[PDB]
Each structure stands twice: as C-alpha cells, then as structure tokens.
Amino acid sequence: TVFRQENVDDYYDTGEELGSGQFAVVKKCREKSTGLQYAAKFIKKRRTKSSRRGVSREDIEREVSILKEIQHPNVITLHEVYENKTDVILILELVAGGELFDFLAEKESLTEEEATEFLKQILNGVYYLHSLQIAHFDLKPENIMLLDRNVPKPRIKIIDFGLAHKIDFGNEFKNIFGTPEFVAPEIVNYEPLGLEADMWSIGVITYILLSGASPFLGDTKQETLANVSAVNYEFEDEYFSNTSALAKDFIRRLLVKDPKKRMTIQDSLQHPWIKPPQFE
Ligand SMILES: CN1CCN(c2cc(-c3ccncc3)cnn2)CC1
C-alpha cells in the first residue's frame, strides 16, 4: 500500500516534540487548511531488506491497517498518512495531557477510585480492540495518554500500535516482544500469543496504579523476564496494606501464567471490583 508522497510541510506546520523513540519521533503539528492540531509520528523506514535499523514496510503497513480500522473514545484515531524515502509519517489525533506514566510520577499515590477511573477506560478501549480481534501487545503507562491532565478524572487514550496484530486464528507466532516489565510469560517464553497477553499487561498496570511499584522488575532486563516467567511477584504490605482484598483478587486473576486460565476482557468488566527490546 502506498501513502501520500507530497511534502508534509506543504500541508502542516510542526511545533514542539511530543515523543521520541527508537525509530520514531512525534511532533505536534497544525494542518494549514483547517487550523486543527495533530501529532505527527515520523517512523524511520528500513534502508535495505537485511537491515536492523528502521521499521520494515510490512510492519508499518500492519500498524497503518489497524489504525485505519479503529474509532473509539479510548483509542487514538489516525487522520492521514504521508511518506517519503526516509519516513512514513502518521498524522494522529493529538492527545496533549501527557503520558499516564508521567502523571503517576508527578502525583502522590492513587486511591482505588482514581485507579479504577483510569482502569475502566483502559478496559473499555481494550474491550473494543479485542472485539476486533486486535491484540495491542505493548500496553504500559507510557502508551496511555491523557486528554487533559488538570481535571479530577482525566480521560485517556491508548497509543502506540507498532506491535499490534490481528489475531484471526486465536494466536499468532511472530517476532513479538514488548517492554520486559509488562510482557506476559508467553512472550518471555516465545510461545504463540493471543489476546490474553494484553490481559496480563493490564494486571501489571493495575498493580502499578495501586502501589507505585512494578511487580516483576529486577535490576536487569533478564532478571525481570525471569521473574515474569516464574510469576515471581507478591503484594507488599507496605504498599498494599490499605488496598481492598477485591482489588488484589482482580490482579491475581490477571497475573496467571497459563493464558487459558487468565481473565478475559469480558471477565474483567464483570469482576466485582469493576462491575457497576528484550536484550540489554
Ligand atoms: C513510548 N512512547 C513512544 C513515543 N510516544 C508517542 C506519543 C504519541 C502521541 C500521540 C498523540 N498525542 C501525543 C503523543 C504517539 N506515539 N508515540 C510516547 C512514548
């Protein structure tokens, strides 16, 4: 699939940087014709077939195909796609209130209600994606951004669909590995992956939202990964002493090694607490 090959600078003006990653940079931008504001994600292309720098065309096309399908209040929307010899440029919905990661750092510890306010939105976005047989494969606080960080109950959107895959056969068996702290055991063990991996990541996020601590984090990536595979976590009383037993029950049903025994997204929404890269 080919994208628009006009110079993006003919149609948009760029401003402040919103994000920076291994093969991408994100710039705030403004469309000249409408005055509306977006986030332009510049993804570096591969220069050769055998190269390790940049993103393969297959991977870029996969991400764009997924983004084109999605429209939901808790997921990002894709506006347009440009390309040139060096980059594919995704013009995405602007989410200007920063990462949930940075919000959690700056704020004192969350209450269970503040945590569930966030978590219910995440669950709603993931329910949409999973209904579509889309696995995100990179859920973590850095990939959730707030629309406005200065309201009591911030609204969120899931971003960063660079690892997302359609799961039409119940699992996929590809080169898929996210951030060690957040990956499921089946990722660590290079086993076939499905929608269940996301549910593990939600359990890790939930743990962090309630405690400010990462459940599997070691001093090195390898130690983290070993901890994940062994399901080596516990609820430290220093952090969880005034956290409800039901909240812990929720996390325990997601941090399950066997993906078939893990709560699904639908189970998570009916749970009584809710119901109303890899190498150093
Ligand atoms: C781990 N990620 C990688 C780089 N970041 C981004 C940010 C955005 C974005 C989208 C809409 N409004 C603002 C920012 C899109 N893609 N990546 C954040 C941290």
Residue spans of the domains in the chain: they are 7-97, 98-276
What is the C-alpha R_g of the chain?
19
Phi then psi for residue 55, to 5 deg, are -110, 135
Given a contact cutoff of 8 angstroms between Cβ atoms, the answer to whether 37 and 20 are in contact is no
Distance 76 CA to ligand 1 centre (A): 10
Q: Which amino acid appears at position 18 of this protein? A: L
Token pair 């390790």: residue: 52
d(CA 68, CA 128): 14
**Which residues does a 6 A CB cutoff place in the pocket of ligand 1?**
18-19, 21, 26, 39, 41, 92, 94-95, 142-143, 145, 159-160
Given a contact cutoff of 8 angstroms between Cβ atoms, the answer to whether 103 and 138 are in contact is no
DSSP secondary structure string, 253-276?
TTS-SSGGGSPPHHHHHHSTTT--
Matching fold, domains 7-97 and 98-276: no
Distance 247 CA to ligand 1 centre (A): 29
Q: In the structure encoding, which two tokens stand for residue 5, read together?
A: 């090959």
DSSP one-letter code for 79? E
Residue of 78, 63, 79 whose CA lies nearest to 166: 63
52: CB partners within 8 A, 6+ apart: none
d(CA 212, CA 251): 14
Q: Which CATH superfamily is domain 98-276 in?
A: Transferase(Phosphotransferase) domain 1 (1.10.510.10)
151: CB partners within 8 A, 6+ apart: none
Q: What is the experimental resolution, given in Å to one decimal place?
A: 1.4
Of the candidates 138, 198, 258, 267, the residue annotated as catalytic is 138
CA distances from 127 to 48, 205, 237 (A): 38, 16, 32
In the structure, how many helices (H) and strands (E) does the chain have?
Answer: 9, 9
- In the residue annotation, 138 being an active-site residue is answered as yes
Experimental method: X-ray
Pairing of β 24-31 and β 12-20: antiparallel
**Geometric angle at alpha carbon 264, from 260 and 265, rounded to 5°:** 160
Given a contact cutoff of 8 angstroms between Cβ atoms, the answer to whether 36 and 77 are in contact is no
d(CA 141, CA 204): 10
Please tell us whether the domain made up of 7-97 is placed in CATH 3.30.200.20.
Answer: yes
Burial code of 161-187, b = ≥16 C-beta within 10 A, e = fewer?
bbbbbebeeebeeeebbbbbbbbbbbb
The length of the chain in residues reads: 280
| Distance in angstroms between the alpha carbons of the first and the last residue of the chain | 35
Distance 8 CA to ligand 1 centre (A): 19
Q: In the structure encoding, which two tokens stand for residue 202, read together?
A: 């939600």
**Ligand 1 mutation target, pool 14, 17, 18, 25, most atoms within 8 A of CB:** 18
Phi then psi for residue 158, to 5 deg, are -75, 135
